[PDB]
Structure formats: C-alpha cells, structure tokens
Amino acid sequence: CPTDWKLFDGTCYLFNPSVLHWADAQESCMKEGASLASIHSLEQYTFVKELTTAALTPSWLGGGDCQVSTRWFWMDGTSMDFTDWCYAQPDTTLTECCIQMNVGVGKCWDDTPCTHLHSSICAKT
Numbered sequence: 001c002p003t004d005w006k007l008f009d010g011t012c013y014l015f016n017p018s019v020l021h022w023a024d025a026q027e028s029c030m031k032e033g034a035s036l037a038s039i040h041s042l043e044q045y046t047f048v049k050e051l052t053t054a055a056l057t058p059s060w061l062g063g064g065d066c067q068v069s070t071r072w073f074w075m076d077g078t079s080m081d082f083t084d085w086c087y088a089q090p091d092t093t094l095t096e097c098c099i100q101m102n103v104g105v106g107k108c109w110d111d112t113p114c115t116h117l118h119s120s121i122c123a124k125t
Contacts (some may be wrong), residue, residue: 002022002032005038008047011123013037015051015059017106019117025073026058029122037123038074039101040082048121049107054098057085060120063099065111076123084109 001012008082016028026036039045039061049056062075072080083090084101086108098114101107101121112118 006051008044011125013048013051014122015057016052016120016122017053017057019119020060022060022064022114025118025120026062026109029062029124030088030123032122034122034124035075036060037080037121038062038076039084040078042082045082045084045101049102050096051121052102054121056099056107057119058102060100060118061099061109062123064097064114065090066094066097066114069094069097086110 001007005012005014020028029036037048052059065070065072086103086106089109090111094111096111098112099119100112101112103110
C-alpha cells in the first residue's frame with residue numbers, strides 16, 4: 001500500500017479527514033485510484049474504524065440507495081451484504097440516501113443527505 005494507506009486482507013485504506021460532500025469525497029478517492037470504501041464484515045468495519053482517529057470521526061462510505069429507495073449499492077462492484085445501521089436507521093427517503101459511518105456514541109451507520117460535509121474512507125486493491 002502507499003504511504004499513509006493501511007493494509008487489511010489485500011485492500012489498502014485511507015482516512016481523508018477533510019470534510020467534503022459525498023461526491024467531492026468520491027472524486028477525491030478517484031484521484032488517488034480509489035473509491036469510497038465498502039464494508040463486508042465486522043473485522044473490515046473494525047479495521048476501518050481504527051483509521052478514523054481516536055475520536056472515530058463520522059465518515060462517508062461508498063454506499064447509498066440514491067437511485068431506487070431501499071436498493072443499496074456500493075461504488076466498488078461489491079454487494080450490500082453487511083450493514084451496521086444505528087437505531088432508527090436506515091432512513092430510505094431519497095433526501096438522505098448516502099451511507100455515513102461512525103455516527104453517535106455507538107459508531108454505527110446512517111443514511112444521510114449526500115450534501116452534508118464529512119470525512120471519508122477511501123479504498124483500493
């Protein structure tokens with residue numbers, strides 16, 4: 001993996017602390033040959049959480065249900081097979097359709113307006 005990137009089971013991950021809307025965050029990962037990350041297991045989730053500072057900063061992931069409500073997709077060609085919704089999630093209204101992790105005291109996932117500004121996780125093989 002490149003400098004600042006961290007390796008787990010064959011994928012390289014980077015925390016981007018700069019707050020960006022989801023599209024700016026995706027484009028920033030793409031400039032580094034990456035995508036906003038997907039998550040497929042509790043251990044992948046734990047590894048990614050460990051990159052988000054001691055504060056476990058709220059961060060964009062590369063998922064959403066922005067095309068058809070209740071149909072979630074990742075940007076990396078993987079399927080939505082693991083979720084960690086917070087209590088009272090997911091909101092399926094299209095107005096909040098992007099996946100944000102590290103939300104609240106329980107550090108879990110929300111569907112959030114994509115135009116909100118957050119840090120983000122990039123991943124590339």
